[PDB]
Amino acid sequence: MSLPAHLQQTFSPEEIQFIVENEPIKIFPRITTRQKIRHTRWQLITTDDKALNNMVAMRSTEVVLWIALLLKQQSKCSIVAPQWLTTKELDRKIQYEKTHPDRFSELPWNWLVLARILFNKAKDDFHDPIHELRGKIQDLREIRQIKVLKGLKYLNESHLQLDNLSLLEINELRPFITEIMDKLREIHTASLT
Amino acid sequence: MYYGISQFSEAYNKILRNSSSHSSCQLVIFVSCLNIDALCATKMLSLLFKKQLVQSQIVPIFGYSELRRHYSQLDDNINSLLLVGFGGVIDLEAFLEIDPQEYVIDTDSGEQSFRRDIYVLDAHRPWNLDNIFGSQIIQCFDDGTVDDTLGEQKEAYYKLLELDRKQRKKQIHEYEGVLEEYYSQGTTVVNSISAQIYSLLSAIGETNLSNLWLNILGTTSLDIAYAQVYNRLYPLLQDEVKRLTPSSRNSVKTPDTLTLNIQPDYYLFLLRHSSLYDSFYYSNYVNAKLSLWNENGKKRLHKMFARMGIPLSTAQETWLYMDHSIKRELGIIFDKNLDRYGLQDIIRDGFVRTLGYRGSISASEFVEALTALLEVGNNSAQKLTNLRKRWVSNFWLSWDALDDRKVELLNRGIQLAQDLQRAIFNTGVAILEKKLIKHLRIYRLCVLQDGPDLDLYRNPLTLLRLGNWLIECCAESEDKQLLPMVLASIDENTDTYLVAGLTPRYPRGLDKKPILNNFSMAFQQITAETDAKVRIDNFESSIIEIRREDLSPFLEKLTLSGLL
Amino acid sequence: KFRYMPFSPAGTPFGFTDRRYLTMNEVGYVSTVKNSEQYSITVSFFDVGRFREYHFEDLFGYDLCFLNEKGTLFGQSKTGQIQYRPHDSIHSNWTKIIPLQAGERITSVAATPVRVIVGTSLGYFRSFNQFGVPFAVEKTSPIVALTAQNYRVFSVHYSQFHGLSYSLSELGTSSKRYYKRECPLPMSLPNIKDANLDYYNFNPMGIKSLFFSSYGDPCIFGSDNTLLLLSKWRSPEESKWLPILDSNMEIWKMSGGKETTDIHVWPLALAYDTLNCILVKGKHIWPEFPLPLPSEMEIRMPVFVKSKLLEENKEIQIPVSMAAEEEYLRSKVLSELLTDTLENDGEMYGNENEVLAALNGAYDKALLRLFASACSDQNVEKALSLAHELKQDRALTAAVKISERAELPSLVKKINNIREARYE
């Protein structure tokens, strides 16, 4: 039809990247665009223009992530990793995960997507050594995958609750969880008078 | 002179001003394929224009006939050209059929400007004076040659250009005499084109380890044939590796650490990717010292491994699987033993890159892989063109193998290089066993009439592998006089011989002023004199093609030529 | 007796390595690499729109540097070689030698748009113009550090026979002034293992950096890890040094109250309200060649009683009285620095008057948050003092509302007297 079959009820991983690229990120500019009191200007229509026309080299600012990546593609920026991409905060989340079998830890919805973007595009901007960050992103990925496999023993006619599951972790499971719960509902509602 | 080393930033800023817009592609790079240095130069220069967001097109070109064809059809919006690796030695203004009056704009004032710039990145000499002085459209880059070497030619060029009877006879034949001595010099390469572009990146402030590796690769490709030039540039590359390498030492290996060390890089064939035995057996230099084509030379090789104390069964193991004790002791084994055979010159320091856990490659081993991709990576006008299309198609295999994301294509290359060097060797022995090198007083002749997988040698580079193998072999023998060598090979389908003129060279350790390839004149001057059918269209103008029956008449007049 | 060493702002020792920073500041950083008995110097910029990085090989072995927005100045402390390299390269580089006596060394160098300034261990002070023409030779107490920003110059002097002192100058294309000459400097020298001694052999004074804030008020970051900013200096009879970061306390606070030894601050610049710095981690105090991103520490007045923070935490939570006391003090000092800049220099971004309006807004909200504690403890007298310092007539309406909510009707009447007095 008008929409391809592999998109009919879900997002492609590239559309899940596009959604995450709409978030604010903190950067250190390597250009001063700010004009002194003593020139081209941004004029955007989907995001706050007033943050970019006021850059000063090495004073941090927030911009939308797709502009930070476009500036970082030149030497013209550096991307400040969020506080949760630190070897301290990842190791507290790994401890939380091991300590609470019944729940996922309070990682932000975009954590796998943003880790994968910044490890490829901003590999030099981490304060911690990136091989220990990749190592702990994998340690978190694997623990949450066990907790997901435990959760699927409970597919149901009524609902599930999946509190801190990432958007990328929901998006891989969507065409399985919803397709099976749909047949459990059809088998159940068929039995009713 | 045209753009000296001090002023490459002005030529680059002129490209940005003229050819940067978000509207259109405006920049064209013509690159000679079949040249690794032009490849590594153009890779750096594309990573630069990527970072500046300059919309550009790269066109690989085989030879002068395709340069005219592609130039003839450039869209008139294209206002900067880079000619990377060719065109310095031809009159480009005459050859491309430029008249600057059809290109001039905004002529006002002691002033001109033009709708196109043609920047020539070339390391060959002798420079054509009508490019270096005699044009405002062509814009050569220089290593320093013009100011250091051409001052008498500059003066002679202008006094002759101004002078459009005793006082005239006394002077016009002095200045034409200076130009007539300036031409009637043989061809030579005097710099790497990649070290020129790295010195431009050093002026802009763009240097990093990726551009430095491409600088090391481009410059290493010279070492086989222009050793005298590699040794000038090598000290300058050592300084840049130190400058860019980070603080840490006794560092833990991690998947992310690139390390670009300076360390022992023995003058052996594909050591880290082959056995320790094949490393010696297929090395040009080793073959030349041991006379390794004939079976007494092979005895000298086994007798050396036995004396070094390495079993043949170990020497033949693939270098990864060869044992941990031999691979660290090897520096001591060679420093003890090689001197007995005169192989002492095999000890060399070179550049070795290792990325993460994927195991080291030296700059020497990497150019052997990249050349093997150019050589074999995949009605006579169709029979040439569908072959020259193949050599343009191979350029993009070598290009993609410069990317770290594409190690499987480098690993294709490292296998192909070992298939080629084996075929070169199995042909080079046939030449030396069957005595096919004839001594013709002025030069040495070799002509491959028939043989196994002879259909390789129709690529100009593969003919030059066999050339460089036969040259090393002769250049180490202490009785032979150094003479120019002519190497010819038949294509049975086109019915031509590919003929290459080769300079000899001094033995690899002796330490003189250079010697120059004057076949580039001798072939033109004999061609102009004869009614024979030839092609003189290759960028390395020491290489020509000739129809089968015309070859013996051509060589018959080459021996008479006073130009060699 | 004491040994004079060459200084450059934020520069680092070689340690066990073959490379170090000659300097860092708001413009960029410079590093030198030892390269088989000659050196290679790379000059790098934090603004890549304005400046293009460069490098050269140095035969002379320079160990002093000063980098500003017009050029880079290099010096060789032991031979008196100096070189100035303008950034546009339309102007030529120039080189000169200055006359050192036996055992004399260049201790520091600086540059200004019109002058190049050199100070030596015998306290000679040599000015050359921007093109290398000698303009003066003064003699002073030996100058252990120099800095400039535009036409302002700030120097720190030390000798066994004089003690620590500073001078502040504004040399100009015309109307040259010296604001302070050799006034005493209230900054701690170190308590004179190799983690510290490999640094104090390289920099005996322990000045980690010397800089002007982005608004041109002098700053110094000493061996005591405290950032001191000079206030009100444009009028010398009212000057004071303010300790605006105790960065040891501010680290202990963010590491959750662990006494933390593996972390050190390395200062680069004070943009308004915020120290740009590298947080270094490990057993050496100073950063390494792949220069980490400058972190940002927000300035904090030293009113944090560590023992009270310990008992209320046993992530750190700060008692809301202590937090209001800091925001009131921090806002009072920053509003005075802006106010004097806006009155003496004028704005450089139109925002500065809207910053000052927003900053007064955080001062009155901090005082009202203290007035609530004074009402909770029914100290009507303390409350009336807090209400009297309050700025906006519209914020004083909140004081009377709080005093009614607290049922302290004495404060209601007294505050009504303040409204009329300030209206008149």
Swiss-Prot record, chain A:
Keywords: DNA replication, Nucleus
CDD domains: GINS_A_psf2, GINS_B_Psf2
GO cellular component: CMG complex; DNA replication preinitiation complex; GINS complex; nuclear replication fork; nucleus
One Pfam family linked to the record: PSF2_N
GO biological process, one term: DNA-templated DNA replication
Cellular localisation: Nucleus
InterPro entries associated with the record: GINS_A (IPR021151), GINS_bundle-like_dom_sf (IPR036224), GINS_Psf2 (IPR007257), PSF2_N (IPR056784)
Keyword Acetylation: no
Description of how the protein assembles with itself and partners: Component of the GINS complex which is a heterotetramer of SLD5, PSF1, PSF2 and PSF3. Interacts with PSF1 and SLD5.
Function: Functions as part of the GINS complex which plays an essential role in the initiation of DNA replication by binding to DNA replication origins and facilitating the assembly of the DNA replication machinery.
Family per record: Belongs to the GINS2/PSF2 family.
Protein name as annotated: DNA replication complex GINS protein PSF2
Upper lineage: Eukaryota, Fungi, Dikarya, Ascomycota, Saccharomycotina
Swiss-Prot record, chain B:
Cellular-component GO terms for this entry: CMG complex; DNA replication preinitiation complex; nuclear replication fork; nucleus
Family: Belongs to the CDC45 family.
Gene Ontology biological process terms in this record: DNA replication initiation; double-strand break repair via break-induced replication; mitotic DNA replication preinitiation complex assembly
InterPro entries: CDC45
Described purpose of this protein according to its UniProt entry: Required for initiation of chromosomal DNA replication. Acts at the origin of replication. Also has a role in minichromosome maintenance.
Complex and partners: Assembles into a complex with MCM5/CDC46. Interacts with MCM10.
Keyword NADP: no
Name of the protein this chain belongs to: Cell division control protein 45
Record localization: Nucleus
Gene encoding the protein: CDC45
Curated annotation (Swiss-Prot), chain C:
Record-annotated membrane-spanning stretches: none
UniProt GO MF annotations: chromatin binding; identical protein binding
Gene Ontology process terms (BP): DNA repair; DNA replication initiation; DNA-templated DNA replication; double-strand break repair via break-induced replication; establishment of sister chromatid cohesion; mitotic cell cycle; mitotic sister chromatid cohesion; nucleosome assembly
Gene Ontology terms: cellular component: Cul8-RING ubiquitin ligase complex; nuclear chromosome; nuclear replication fork; nucleus
Cellular localisation: Nucleus
Record bears the keyword Membrane: no
WD repeat residue numbers: 222-262
Keywords of the record: DNA replication, Nucleus, Phosphoprotein, Repeat, WD repeat
Stated role: Accessory factor for DNA replication. It plays a role in accurately duplicating the genome in vivo.
Note, other: Present with 3280 molecules/cell in log phase SD medium.
Protein name in UniProt: DNA polymerase alpha-binding protein
Organism, as annotated: Saccharomyces cerevisiae (strain ATCC 204508 / S288c)
Phylogenetic classification of the source organism: Eukaryota, Fungi, Dikarya, Ascomycota, Saccharomycotina
Gene: CTF4
